[PDB]
Point group: D2
Chain length 479, copies 4
């Protein structure tokens, strides 16, 4: 078995294969640099209820994704214990907090933040999850700017955070202990003939043979499998959801006891603080879908992240020391849903397109793919997210066009801007036309979700035309 990729998904599937099949040799590719790596840039939140939006819980596909995340939450306590057990006290703790506080402030669009706070509260009640709406005065540690302060707060029990760096170290250590082999090179090419995997050509010229290849190369995953015959239009494209976060040494070495977060905001960005050991905090995180990868933060992203954290969470962060600006690529699937499971090629498996919550879902997704590889059926509701599929259409064109305009306006309210009071209504009405025109021009059947549509809108004419050709070719293959 060859696992291509050394993120949380690659290492999590590698650990589960190695522990479950002591008979077989499991090799994991990827370099310690983790170029464009989502995982090292993550806080990370074990986000289930925190990730709830009204827009997600309005599609069937979205209610399924939410159910899996609740399931994944139940595996974390044992999974952590099983990974910490292969190390000692000095390797540090994977778990960084047990609980999450969701804050509602007015530094954002009512049509996102108000709707999403209600949707979160509703989803917690429906799943009988333990939680409490609390007085903002009772939230410890936070010292916001009064003009940016929260007026409602929501304590969620058993929704916490891990140190993504210590998790990666624990997965690697646990992989070696169970007999896995780390080979620090990149796959250039997957070899297949007569509908079967032969193995993987590596970037130092070598060839490794295998009967099983699991692709978990984050945002590079589809580009790798698409080179095989016919698969270019049968595996949905994955783009880079570029994300900026930061490590900060607090002025007084303090930190909050819980995760602090807002609901998801414009184009699936969001404001959160994840606690860390040793007088550090994690703050994140921006999101921008890019058609080409990018390994460095923009000035705009750094300023936005720091302005939100200092005003909405703690003014003390203003006088605190910046240790590190982190950048990673959320694997952003073109149809807004993960690529998990088997292929029309025997022994070829895919584990990618997890966007915001691959890390959270890692233990569930790992056990699902391992079960499928062993002749089982894995977890029930994952069937729809099979990697070899027609692009999913989870929303009407009309729903997406309302969403893209709302989210575009939300980039204004989140700044927050100060405008003449008639300007917002004028921009609302003048945004509808150009986005309606773009959607009609791209395809008669497929509509990109908002996050991707805004990226396409501000891309070059050549990049747009290439997407028209892609969408048309996918329609030819499937309809």
């Amino acid at each position: 078995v060859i696992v291509v990729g050394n993120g949380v998904l690659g290492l999590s599937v590698g650990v589960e294969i190695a522990r479950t099949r002591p008979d077989v040799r499991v090799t994991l590719l990827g370099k310690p640099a983790r170029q464009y790596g989502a995982t090292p840039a993550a806080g990370a939140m074990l986000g289930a209820f925190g990730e709830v939006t009204a827009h997600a819980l309005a599609s069937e596909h979205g209610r399924k994704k939410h159910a899996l995340a609740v399931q994944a939450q139940r595996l974390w306590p044992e999974w952590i214990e099983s990974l910490e057990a292969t190390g000692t006290a000095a390797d540090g703790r994977i778990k960084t907090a047990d609980d999450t506080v969701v804050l509602l402030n007015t530094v954002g669009h009512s049509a996102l933040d108000d709707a999403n706070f209600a949707a979160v509260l509703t989803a917690l009640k429906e799943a009988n999850a333990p939680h409490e709406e609390i007085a903002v005065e009772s939230v410890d540690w936070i010292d916001p700017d009064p003009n940016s302060r929260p007026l409602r707060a929501l304590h969620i029990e058993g929704e916490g955070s891990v140190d993504s760096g210590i998790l990666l170290a624990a997965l690697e250590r646990s992989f070696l202990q169970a007999g896995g082999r780390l080979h620090p090179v990149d796959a250039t090419e997957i070899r297949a003939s007569h509908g079967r995997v032969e193995g993987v050509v590596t970037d130092d010229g070598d060839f490794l043979p295998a009967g099983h290849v699991v692709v978990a190369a984050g945002a590079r995953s589809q580009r790798l499998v698409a080179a095989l015959p016919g698969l270019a239009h049968r595996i949905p494209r994955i783009y880079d959801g570029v994300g900026v976060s930061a490590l900060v040494d607090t002025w007084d070495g303090s930190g909050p006891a819980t995760v602090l977060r807002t609901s998801n905001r414009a184009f699936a960005c969001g404001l959160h603080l994840v606690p860390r050991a040793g007088g550090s905090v994690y703050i994140g995180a921006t999101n921008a879908v890019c058609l080409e990868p990018r390994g460095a933060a923009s000035i705009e992203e750094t300023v936005f992240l720091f302005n939100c954290a200092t005003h909405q969470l703690h003014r003390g962060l203003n006088g605190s020391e910046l240790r590190k600006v982190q950048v990673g690529s959320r694997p952003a699937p073109i149809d807004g849903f993960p690529l998990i499971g088997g292929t029309s090629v025997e022994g070829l498996w895919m584990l990618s397109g997890t966007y915001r919550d691959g890390l959270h879902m890692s233990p569930l997704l790992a056990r699902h793919v391992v079960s499928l590889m062993d002749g089982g059926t894995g977890v029930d509701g994952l069937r729809e997210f099979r990697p070899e599929r027609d692009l999913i259409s989870a929303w009407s064109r009309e729903e997406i066009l309302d969403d893209v305009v709302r989210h575009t306006m939300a980039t204004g309210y989140e700044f927050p801007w100060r405008l003449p009071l008639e300007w917002p209504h004028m921009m609302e009405t003048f945004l509808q036309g150009p986005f309606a025109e773009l959607a009609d021009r791209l395809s008669d059947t497929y509509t990109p979700p908002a996050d991707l549509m805004t990226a396409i809108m501000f891309s070059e004419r050549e990049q747009q035309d290439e997407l028209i050709a892609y969408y048309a070719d996918v329609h030819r293959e499937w309809h």
Copy 2:
């Protein structure tokens, strides 16, 4: 016996109506001109504020918990009082009542130390009095279309807390006064005449003299200045200053209006944002407050901008494109010790009804019946005895409480703008404000401390005006100790 009421505000006319109806024996004359120079009443929306007027700082003093209780009592008189005033007119005179209910909104365009504390205090006071009310989803508040960055995140529906049209109320009081046999004489009192400790009557500003055995002073912010001319009384009747207030009448873009009063809790130095409905495609928006040591009859640019910016962002962006019909200015009678001047004097037949600051209009029917009862040999309403006009200045708060209050409220003028500052600046201004206000309080008197609303005015007044107040405070101490 002749009665003269000096002043044609809600208090003067309300006491006039109650005297005329209750004492057909006596001839009652009411002074004051249709211009109503500095008049608080014509500038008022006005809200029938009881629970809406609740602040943590008010409900932390004994004197404040009493004032709150009276306001609940006054609310119960309004339905019959309105019916009794509307009955003397016809359909074409219009309705006094403009709304039955109030929605209190909480947004972040203000200080947490005022707006958060005051929202909790209101919710607590409604539960304690078992008053009908409901915390409601903001999405369910009709009509409002705020700027999302200025929007409310909590709303509170209060049943039976409403509003009157102050202009139609004044017209109904005048009409009801004439009907019950009162006489309107449209001149101003210049001087009250007394000898051998008894009122003889009133010299008017056209040179005339009207005799009377009873004179009720309800001249709003001019009330103390009028009585202080009599011997010894300069330091025995607490001073009343002008709480200058700006409001506006707006013709809405589409002729619509909210069905309820829309308001925030009280804000920096007893200002606040509210919209009171009106008939005929108009709304009232108010209202600023600034205590001034001299009267002022015109709005400042700053006040108009602040009022319009708050209403357009926090209540309805449609007000931005709406037509300004009228900018209104009136003087809230602001008593130097923060409590009303209601009742009898050391001079026989001399009565005072003033210093009501924010809520004289709301309390008018109760205050009217109280003074009328005292005039007829009764005891009126319990606990209004404490606000007798001839007294030593009251000390309802420690110097320490007021200095915390004045700094908090000063910072609140920043958060209400709202300003945008570097994040360390507010803490720096907080610490550098304490000293100058502590220094001012120590310099003014060893016993008396002005409440916050007045202290900020004194801080930014001239050196001569400050020294004159040191002499006033010292002279009051001499008289009473």
Copy 3:
């Protein structure tokens, strides 16, 4: 008859009335209009005697605009004698018409570079070309001003002999001077002009009466076209005049002081601008907003009052913040649909028009008065004003392309003038998304006529019915003239 009726009691009506009465003592001159001056531009004006201050790059780029500038310089030379001739009919207690001799133009960054930077250069250039006396001065040397440092000027321009009048005292002096020269004030409004066999008979008034005349001069500001359009054929031969609604304010200064000069910026988004005109007695005038409306409006909007007060308190003097508001003023600048005045004779004998002066009718009043009087007496008046004859095809002084660039720039300028605070990529996004809807509107309205920017923004945000009515108007005008 040989009777003259002037319809309208603004600066133009009263100025033409005074010149007729003084020049024709033989004939009876009657002037209509009420003391309320409903929608009156003149009482709402500061007013600036604007020539060089009114210079924009966009104006000095069209032929029609370079002509307008030349007339304004000419009008400036008449003001000293005109004032003396009006003050002479009164006494000391009637007060002074002139309120300042000089103007300072300020450049700050509370606005669009594409307007304020270009227009400051255009003003400086036009002063040098005309050899007019002026000096670029240190901002530190500008007396009185106390701006917010973040809104302060970094360049200032002193213009000698470009000053201001009190519009109220001017109106009082014109009325008094009209009576003195033998004119009669009849305080009613004209409802209808009577003509038959291509000749004026007179005017039906709003109290039911009929006044006969051989001459009718229409100077009814923004109501002027609506009045003449009722005559046969003239509906599509006299270009429409709309209301350029303007808000200004009288303020009693905190300490009773005022600047010795006019203080102003160059003209800004959609021909608004910030200025302070001195007044006697501890008052200043601040103005002035501009918004073209398809229907008249007699009350300021909240938005206009806030914008005017925010600009004055930040850009001129923070002391205005603590100063007392005496009066909010509203008047209608007569806004001609083709962006040029309506001055002179008609196809109807004895019917004359004096309107569509937009921002500078008051400044040009003495010149315009003498021009119309000269035409009435068989002369040719002033040379370049023949072009602005009221009975004409709509003028096309700019290409559709020039106007579409202008309307987008000016729209963005309403942002920079607020001033807004936005993420840095938002302005470029709004620029590109504004082009399409305005290009679409211009193509839909007519294949030949394009409204100027000030009017196009008003049409863009008007109702569908009002837009369709304008398509019918433009088409009917094309039918009449082509």
Copy 4:
């Protein structure tokens, strides 16, 4: 021993090392310091060759300040030959030290009038007095810049022959030139200077070793005083040097472009400032914040990064918003407690100091190098450097009154530079309430010494213990010298 040890591998250490090695081929010159350059000012610098750009009205109002300005003009004349002499020891592929020949100073309103307006005038005046070539230019003529119109400049000043170096390539060229002239690099730190009978013996290093020498030049940036103060009596005879912590950034421009000149403002609140220094290969340098800290700090604060990035994206180029951040840099400007450098000889024979250069050590390096070398060789070096001898009483270059005006103005300037938005009466209120607490602090610290504004603000917001320690220091210095 005729051995020379230079302690420190910044621009000053390496510049004095190069000049000693080239001028004394007879003697062994050894230079200490590690390639990490912990807290190193030089690697964090753009850097500007700032003479006229560094001019403030406040500097040119003291005698001590006019002297400092004169030295900077002198240093400018040495740069062309100094660069040629350093580039000559390498080849084309080592890169160019010079990154621009010229500087544009921009004036915008995103700041205090009392600093930016006064400092623009002071710069223009100082250029004329020194007969330096320069021109006030139209802002429209400044290449490359694309500011936010609300943050744009309205005046610009082109300075010829005031340029920039790549601080990294300069360090590489100094090292190369040092080895070429026979110098020896020993990459350890000095822990202690050895002296007995009033003479230097040598230097104990941080790996336990001892290097002997007859000459020790201390150029250890902000660590320089702490090192020499350990010798007897010198604790109160060498003025303290604190860390002027500075944040800058390397940015890869969206399109790989860069300006042809340095772009800068005048110096702003507490000696911060906005500048862009060009670099080769699609990079620009942006800087630079300043905060005097009583303890060293090796990491930027969130506040510093946000302020630097907000100023650059609004005031210079909006394209920087979408550009990639390559590196956030932090270095310690050596901040002398009396606001003047420590350059020259000591009461200890063979002990020399070269530090406390704050903002312009790099610029002055060639002059300061030649001065110390001349003193070491029995000469008098450069004339106006005498006052800045390292062993001295604290200088009092300003009255307490001048500093208290300065600290309040600069404090307010942190507001206007944000830029904040407040109610218009708030600034005057904070001005009057700031005077008291700073007057109280100054009186409490000493009856004779007053810290300059940059240091006073740091002391004001430090702990009570740190303040009391400064009262003891000031009192001990008074005891020693009076």
